[PDB]
Design a protein around this ligand. Structure first.
Ligand SMILES: Nc1ncnc2c1ncn2[C@@H]1O[C@H](COP(=O)(O)OP(=O)(O)OP(=O)(O)O)[C@@H](O)[C@H]1O
Ligand SMILES: Nc1ncnc2c1ncn2[C@@H]1O[C@H](COP(=O)(O)OP(=O)(O)O)[C@@H](O)[C@H]1O
Lengths: 236, 384, 394, 54, 213
């Protein structure tokens, strides 16, 4: 009986509907939601020109991952809020992906759709639906793309602010126009730390080119420096 | 089980011994009367023959049905889980106390007669709002104001502290207490202490959570919160961010203003409706009470008014000495220097400054916090 | 002296009680099972009688019979329609067309009729228990009390004068007044006062989701009322069900108009409700539709306002009937110290006076305590006060 | 000379022979009685509209 | 016409007048959560009406389905407009019938959809106004047909005192007087009784009548 996992499939007789055998691997709703998301798995070595932001995100969240006793010696509270802001999709999305990649955390980024709602709950009255999926997968992180968006984010922040008794839970919301965000979400205790994605320059585009063209079939001799010079810092 | 509730003696008097002897004699007489039934006409095991006969009589495969009406005389009307309405009767073990619409009634497999009831362990609305563990430490962790700590205690805990003091005075606890204060005033910190000290059930309600996207939904959510909290147990349910009733407009809800208005009317009805809600207390807080519906505040629905101001220059000292209790801060700086740094430094400001100083100390992996860390945290907190 | 002698003996008896009760069988906690000493009848005969004798006889809906013969028609909401017939244990006068009944599970013949389905949405909305609000506890509105009794109680109390007089009793009553002025405090009074069923239709309890899914609730409530002998349906917050029709441009705020129209139709005209008296209570009646307030449906238009000089005194005398206060208190001076306050405000003032007295050391309320409570409840909480924004009824 | 009818259970079945009443007796859109056992149309239900209109 | 200018009275008179079967349909009554279920309920209504050729069908509160159509994406009661269109189609036009007559009662003709008043659907538009002075006394004579009052009431005088009152309220004044008469325990109704009832029907409480003498 114990081996028979609740919310799992076991064989059932027909004339009797008596147990016949277990069912191995029927389904995981969180895995299905993630597959619907189709997250772009990345790698920390493929991060483009945001090294300091890389350590900041590491020092922001990952520190209480490979060393949970770091803040205990100093007696400081666990950081809660981290957001990605700046030019849209300037690599901030890629930086977030690489964060989980090098950190091994459960990535879940939502856009407030309705198809995924079929896996969180029947009605999804409150925003606690996602937490239930995360609540059993503690090694998880939360990412949210760029007015009800703040309302869901407002509830999440309030949820993971002392009311959520679970420790080692990370949520990161990414959007543009930080001066246009919700003033209620601008409370000093909500956003534990802030990181922006400034438009890369030529000094930054060189590594961006080295990463992007790495997978292409170039011609003997590249001379990408001049092209990057022709690139007047457009975006990531 | 509940054989005798008389414990008034609470001593070694002969009355307690006599009562115990009488109870023992009655139990022995009952046991002797019962034993002879099996000695003379056992006629069966009475331990497993009855259970086996019940299992073989009631349909072995019991389905998940749903009771929808009440028929006292060996009858019941329900709908088949496929959909076909049934006229299943009542069985011998019916114990017809859960005869309410919704509880699945299990019928037989041979004749589909009511076999068993459906134990319910869901309460979705209550679960999506039930506090499992204490949020924070005792009331001492709030710090500084305690003008409502006594007031809030009298409003909630004092009724639960020893409800004879208000009984001896000939009155019932205050209706409700609405905590309105400046942004980040610590209202949520007050609910933290309320929960860490609370004794009865507590429900947490996100302010926007009352406004749903489908027209008519919001009133249903309010009625469901009222049913869950009231029908569950004595409760202290805090609907935080009440200003979200009409302040914020979202395109998700089909209805316009006449939907937030309907939700507010339903909330008012659920607070002071046409029945006895029972022993239920409400403690709501808001940061912009200037727009809250006037009817939802008239004495009789929300009784106690509590205002939370920013931490005082004398209270700021306790706030700082509290939020930095376990920090290994170096004696290089004096907190009073930053105590007057901000002209209107609220309670959240002190916590933000402490967190920023800790983070800055962390970036260098140093063991203590220096004055420069606090100086650099102060600008990053207030100035942005 | 024998501290351990008695505790050990008591513990032994307590343990033996369970050790002997477990020998008959109360244990094995089930998930909805009755006591083995509660289903004893059905062991070999009763179960073989409660089970073998009867059949499920699934219930369905009838359409109509066909003349020239029994020629009844069987129809299933979710299974199928079919030409069927009743059983040998039914009468042919009761062949109601469109009647919920069960048919022989095998013979597919209706063997048992049934009462109409209850639609638990409007079945849960019955009082079934009058509130604890009595006439002596709602003082301050004696004229309104008499007016409401003449419509709900007096006409039904001695239905001999109205027949002799030769005039139809007044139809209903609408109580519109400033918020907190005592509307529900009297509706609970009406409920605990008479004996006829009172249906509480919370103004929000009628706005349904689907298009027209709400009006159907009005018809259900009206039928459940007319089914009984005499009913009095009290609807509160009547400002939500429907205010008026003002459609302009894109269709908005119209769905509530259909609900209000359905409520009116079941209330007036076309074989009206008859033995059902309406008792509504709006708090902002300014938006009430002209058709609903038009006499003949809600003829009485009683209004409940703030007690002027003696209403406050009566409220103090009533709401303070169980408060330990000094006998030398001058309540009338308090009633003169509250220029325009609501009755709920008076009850809250009595409460706050109790709390302040219990605050520091006292055991009985003091006149100065009530004075200080007035200074905060009325003079301190006056910022909103809920009165000024609704006094004009807008 | 053909018979076409659909059951009240989202099931459609036809009989090569009309039944008790010849096709002259019946017309399209009609609602009649058929055998649940033999799946044979026995008689014709005269008429019944929804009780709501009734 | 007005809320109580009288349409239910005319309908009830027409019902007992003709020697046929009258069809009673409630304005909002013909709707359903199902997509177009109201269309089917209206088609069955028209068929049942055709059942007995001699018959009249009255669609009271025609404003429920007669709501003017709107132009909006989200909402607009598309089902209600569908029911209105079904009623229009069943009324006259393609495969109409001339066997019965339908009497409709609407309280606000402005909200009525333009199609609902298109000759074929409705031919004779009759607006019922409130009795001014003479029908104001006729209403009192009728509604007080069985009321027993001594010959001390001037029906015309009360009619002149009842200014801009509706027929429903006019008759309700009689009920208010009858209830006040029961309060007085007397046997007949005095002119002062009807005068007080007229005042009670207005529902205008006097409070320190000094600002306006
Ligand atoms: N005349 C009165 N006698 C006794 N209690 C009264 C009276 N008027 C008001 N109350 C008090 O008012 C409360 C119930 O009335 P309530 O405030 O619900 O009236 P209401 O007008 O229906 O309010 P709302 O319209 O805002 O819902 C109780 O505390 C009751 O004791
Ligand atoms: N002593 C204190 N007094 C007031 N607020 C405090 C105190 N200590 C901490 N806080 C802060 O008060 C906040 C509690 O939430 P609250 O201020 O009610 O938020 P909001 O007003 O936006 O709902 C937290 O940010 C917490 O860190």
């Amino acid at each position: 009986i114990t081996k028979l996992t609740p919310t799992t499939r076991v064989a059932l007789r027909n004339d009797s509907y008596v147990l016949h055998l277990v069912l191995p691997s029927k389904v995981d709703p969180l895995v299905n939601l993630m597959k619907v998301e189709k997250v772009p798995d990345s790698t920390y070595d493929m991060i483009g020109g945001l090294d300091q932001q890389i350590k900041e995100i590491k020092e922001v969240i990952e520190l209480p991952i490979k060393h949970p006793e770091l803040f205990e010696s100093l007696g400081i509270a666990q950081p809660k809020g981290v957001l990605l802001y700046g030019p849209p999709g300037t690599g901030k999305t890629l930086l977030a992906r690489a964060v989980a990649h090098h950190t091994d955390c459960t990535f879940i980024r939502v856009s407030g759709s309705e198809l995924v709602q079929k896996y969180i709950g029947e009605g999804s009255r409150m925003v606690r639906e996602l937490f239930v999926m995360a609540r059993e997968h503690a090694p998880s992180i939360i990412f949210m793309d760029e007015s009800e968006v703040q309302r869901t984010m407002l509830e999440l922040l309030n949820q993971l602010d002392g009311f959520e008794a679970s420790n080692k839970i990370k949520v990161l919301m990414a959007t543009n126009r930080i001066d246009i965000l919700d003033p209620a979400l601008l409370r000093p205790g909500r956003i534990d730390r802030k990181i922006e994605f400034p438009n890369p320059t030529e000094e930054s585009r060189f590594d961006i080119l080295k990463i992007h063209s790495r997978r292409m079939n170039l011609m003997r001799g590249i001379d990408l420096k001049k092209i990057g010079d022709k690139m007047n810092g457009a975006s990531g | 089980a509940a054989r005798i509730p008389t414990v008034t003696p609470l001593t070694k008097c002969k009355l307690r011994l006599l009562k115990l002897e009488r109870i023992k004699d009655y139990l022995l007489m009952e046991e002797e009367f019962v034993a002879n039934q099996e000695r003379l006409k056992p006629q069966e095991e009475k331990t497993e023959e009855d259970r086996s006969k019940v299992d073989d009589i009631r349909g072995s495969p019991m389905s998940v049905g749903s009771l929808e009406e009440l028929i006292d005389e060996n009858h019941a009307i329900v709908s088949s889980s496929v959909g076909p309405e049934y006229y299943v009767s009542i069985m011998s073990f019916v114990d017809k106390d859960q005869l309410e619409p919704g509880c699945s009634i299990l019928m037989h497999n041979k004749v589909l007669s009511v076999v068993g009831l459906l134990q319910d362990e869901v309460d979705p609305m209550v679960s999506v709002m039930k506090v499992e563990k204490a949020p924070l430490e005792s009331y001492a962790d709030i710090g500084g104001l305690d003008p409502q700590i006594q007031e809030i205690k009298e409003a909630v805990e004092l009724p639960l502290t020893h409800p004879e003091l208000y009984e001896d005075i000939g009155i019932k606890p205050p209706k409700g207490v609405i905590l309105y204060g400046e942004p980040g005033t610590g209202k949520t910190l007050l609910a933290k202490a309320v929960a860490n000290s609370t004794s009865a059930t507590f429900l947490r309600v996100v302010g926007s959570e009352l406004i749903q996207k489908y027209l008519g939904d919001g009133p249903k959510l309010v009625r469901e919160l009222f049913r869950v909290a009231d029908d569950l147990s004595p409760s202290i349910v805090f609907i935080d961010e009440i200003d979200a009733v009409g302040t914020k407009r979202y395109d998700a809800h089909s209805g316009g203003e006449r939907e937030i208005q309907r939700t507010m009317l339903e909330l008012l009805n659920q607070l002071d409706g046409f029945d006895s809600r029972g022993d239920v207390k409400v403690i709501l807080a808001t940061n912009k009470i200037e727009s809250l519906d006037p009817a939802l505040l008239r004495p009789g629905r929300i009784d106690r008014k509590i205002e939370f101001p920013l931490p005082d220059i004398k209270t700021r000292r306790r706030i700082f000495t509290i939020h930095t209790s376990k920090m290994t801060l170096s004696d290089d700086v004096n907190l009073e220097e930053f105590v007057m740094t901000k002209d209107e430094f609220s309670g959240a400001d002190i916590k933000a400054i402490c967190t920023e100083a800790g983070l800055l100390a962390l970036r260098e992996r140093r063991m203590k916090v220096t004055h420069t860390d606090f100086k650099k945290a102060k600008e990053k907190v207030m100035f942005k | 002296p024998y501290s351990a002698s008695i505790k050990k003996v008591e513990k032994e008896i307590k343990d033996m009680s369970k050790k002997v009760n477990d020998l008959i069988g109360i244990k094995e906690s089930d998930t909805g099972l009755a006591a083995p000493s509660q289903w004893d009848l059905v062991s070999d005969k009763q179960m073989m009688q409660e089970e073998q004798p009867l059949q499920v006889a699934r219930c369905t809906k009838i359409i109509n019979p066909n003349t020239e013969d029994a020629k009844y028609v069987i129809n299933v909401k979710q299974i199928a329609k079919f030409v069927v017939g009743l059983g040998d244990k039914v009468s042919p006068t009761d062949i109601e067309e469109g009647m919920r009944v069960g048919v022989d599970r095998n013979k597919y013949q209706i063997q048992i009729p049934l009462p109409p389905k209850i639609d638990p949405s409007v079945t849960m909305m019955t009082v079934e228990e009058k509130p604890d609000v009595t006439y002596n506890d709602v003082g301050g509105c004696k004229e309104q009390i008499e007016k409401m009794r003449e419509v709900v109680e007096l006409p039904m109390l001695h239905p001999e004068k109205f027949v002799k007089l030769g005039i139809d009793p007044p139809k209903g009553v609408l109580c519109y007044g400033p918020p907190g002025t005592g509307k529900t405090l009297l509706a609970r009074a009406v409920a605990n006062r008479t004996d006829a069923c009172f249906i509480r239709v919370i103004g929000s309890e009628l706005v349904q989701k689907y298009v027209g899914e709400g009006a159907r609730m009005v018809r259900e409530l009206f039928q459940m009322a007319r089914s009984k002998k005499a009913c009095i349906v009290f609807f509160d917050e009547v400002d939500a069900i429907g205010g008026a029709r003002f459609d302009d441009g894109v269709g908005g705020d119209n769905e509530v108009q259909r609900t209000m129209l359905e409520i009116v139709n079941q209330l007036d005209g076309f074989d009206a409700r008859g033995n059902i008296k309406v008792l509504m209570a709006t708090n902002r009646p300014d938006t009430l539709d002209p058709a609903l307030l038009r006499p003949g449906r809600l003829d009485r238009k009683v209004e409940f306002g703030l007690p002027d000089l003696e209403g406050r005194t009566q409220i103090f005398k009533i709401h303070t009937r169980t408060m330990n206060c000094e006998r030398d208190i001058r309540f009338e001076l308090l009633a003169r110290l509250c220029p325009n306050s609501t009755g709920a405000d008076i009850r809250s003032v009595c409460t706050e006076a109790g709390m302040y007295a219990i605050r520091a050391r006292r055991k009985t309320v003091t006149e100065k305590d009530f004075l200080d409570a007035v200074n905060k409840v009325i003079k301190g909480y006056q910022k909103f006060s809920a009165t000024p924004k609704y006094m004009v009824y807008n | 000379k053909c018979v076409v009818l659909k059951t009240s259970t989202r099931q459609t079945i036809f009989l090569p022979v009309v039944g008790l009443v010849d096709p002259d007796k019946l017309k399209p859109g009609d609602l009649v009685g058929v055998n649940k056992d033999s799946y044979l149309i026995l008689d014709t239900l005269p008429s019944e509209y929804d009780s709501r209109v009734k | 016409g007005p809320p109580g200018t009288g349409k239910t009275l005319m309908a009830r008179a027409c019902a007992a007048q003709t020697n046929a079967t009258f069809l009673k349909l409630a304005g909002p009554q013909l709707v359903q959560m199902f997509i177009g279920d109201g269309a089917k309920l209206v088609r069955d209504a028209f068929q049942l009406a055709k059942e007995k050729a001699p018959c009249i069908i009255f669609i009271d509160e025609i404003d429920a389905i007669g709501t003017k159509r709107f132009d909006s994406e989200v909402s607009g009661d598309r089902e209600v407009q569908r029911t209105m269109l079904e009623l229009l189609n069943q009324l006259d036009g393609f495969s109409s019938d001339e066997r019965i007559k339908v009497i409709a009662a609407t309280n606000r003709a402005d909200i009525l959809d333009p199609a609902l008043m298109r000759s074929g659907r409705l031919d004779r538009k009759i607006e019922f106004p409130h009795p001014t002075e003479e029908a104001r006394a006729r209403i009192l004579q009728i509604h007080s047909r069985k009321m027993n009052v001594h010959p001390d009431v001037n029906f015309e005088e009360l009619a002149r005192s009842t200014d801009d009152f509706n027929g429903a309220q006019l008759k309700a004044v009689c009920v208010e007087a009858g209830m006040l008469a029961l309060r007085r325990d007397a046997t007949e109704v005095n002119h002062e009784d009807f005068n007080e009832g007229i005042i009670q029907v207005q529902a205008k409480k006097k409070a320190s009548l000094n600002y306006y003498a």
